[PDB]
Amino acid sequence: TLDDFLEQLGQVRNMGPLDELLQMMPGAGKMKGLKNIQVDEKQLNHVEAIIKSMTVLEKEQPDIINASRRKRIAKGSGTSVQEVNRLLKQFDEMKKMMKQMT
Amino acid sequence: LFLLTVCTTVLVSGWVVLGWME
RNA sequence: GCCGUGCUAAGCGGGGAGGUAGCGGUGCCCUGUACCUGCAAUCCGCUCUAGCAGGGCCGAAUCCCUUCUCGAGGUUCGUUUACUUUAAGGCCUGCCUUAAGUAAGUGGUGUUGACGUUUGGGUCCUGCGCAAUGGGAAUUCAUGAACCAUGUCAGGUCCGGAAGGAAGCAGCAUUAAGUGAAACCUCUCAUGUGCCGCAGGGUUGCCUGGGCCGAGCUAACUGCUUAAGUAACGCUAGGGUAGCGAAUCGACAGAAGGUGCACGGU
């Protein structure tokens, strides 16, 4: 859920240098992908604000988040709307990859 | 095992931040 | 005529009833055995009178005919008596459906006096009226809202060099939305809550039981009595049948009489 997504971005900022993993310790580059470009991010990080605006119910069941709920979340994070819709699509592909492996 | 799980989670978060096509 | 030897006729069962215009037979019955065969029942062969045809036995006669007597039986009509079948006719009789009244057997209830004396319980139907208390709400406490209440909104977010604003989520009140807990105060509907307000139907038409006083009603199942109703089982007419009678035909037994011819001898 979104409470877990923020924790992953929060732990990335906590333990991440030069987008490590990606040879952060040598530091030259260094971006692990290459790359970088960051790769993420000055906007993926905001990702934290969108999940923060959600309720406890909305976080536990993201399938309940529709038009009237989205419009409320966007106004509380000062977003729109395409940036939040991007974060949720990325999270959907993550759980598909998590259940398939470990 | 727990440590491994944590690492995996972190990786997933990083990927999300990067963004990528479906 | 008396004797000897022959032949003919007759005969070799009859009767009753029906039928046929009769007279017969075949058939049915009555008496007996008393020759044979062809015909006879939509009757058939006849019509005087004889069964048609054909054949065998006996012969004038105790064994041929006639008549009286006796009487097995056929038929018909009528009465008294018994049985069977069928139908009217009716309070003899079975039975519908019954009116009135009373007696005993049983229950019961109430009609008269229902006076009068006793009591308990119950009823108990219609209709309206009402409160009760039985249910449904305000109310109250508790709780109580990511996004589309609110109050208070830490922390992230934005505008900005600052002073000051923007978006307003988590959380926590109260209140919407609700939720839970019980009950005064508040609304609403009402059951033996009261029959408390009353009317009508019986205010005694009752329901029930018990102690009672002469009729009563009811089961009128039984008794007596009187009056109605259907028809046959038990009653009356016709038919058949037995003990009765009349009529008319008649087997059988028995009595009285009548029935020929040829030749030879004399």
Q: Residue A79: give its domain's CATH number.
A: 1.10.260.30
Please tell me the distance from the alpha carbon of residue A67 to that of residue A42, in angstroms, as a whole number.
26
Top residue of B16, B20, B21, B22 to mutate, by most chain A CBs within 10 Å, is: B16
Tell if A31 CB is < 7 Å from nucleic strand C.
no
Instruction: Name residues whose C-beta falls within 8 Å of residue A22's C-beta, 6 or more positions apart in sequence.
Output: A29, A30, A31, A32, A33, A35
The dihedral sign for the CA sequence A61, A66, A68, A72: positive
**Pick from B5, B11, B19: which is nearest to A40 by CB?**
B19
Contact A45, A13 (CB under 8 A): yes
Contact A50, A2 (CB under 8 A): yes
Burial of A52 (0-12, 13-18, 19+ CB in 10 A): middle
Please tell me the distance from the alpha carbon of residue A79 to that of residue A96, in angstroms, as a whole number.
26
Instruction: Name residues whose C-beta falls within 8 Å of residue B10's C-beta, 6 or more positions apart in sequence.
Output: A8, A11, A12, A15
Straight-line distance from the first to the last Cα atom of chain A, in angstroms, rounded to the nearest whole number: 17
Task: Give the number of domains in chain A.
Answer: 1
Residues of A in contact with B15 (CB under 8 A): 90, 94
- Å separating the CA of residue A74 from the C1' of nucleotide C52: 155
Q: Which domain holds residue A93?
A: 2-100
Resolution (A): 7.0
Q: CA torsion A21→A24→A30→A32, rounded to 10°?
A: -10
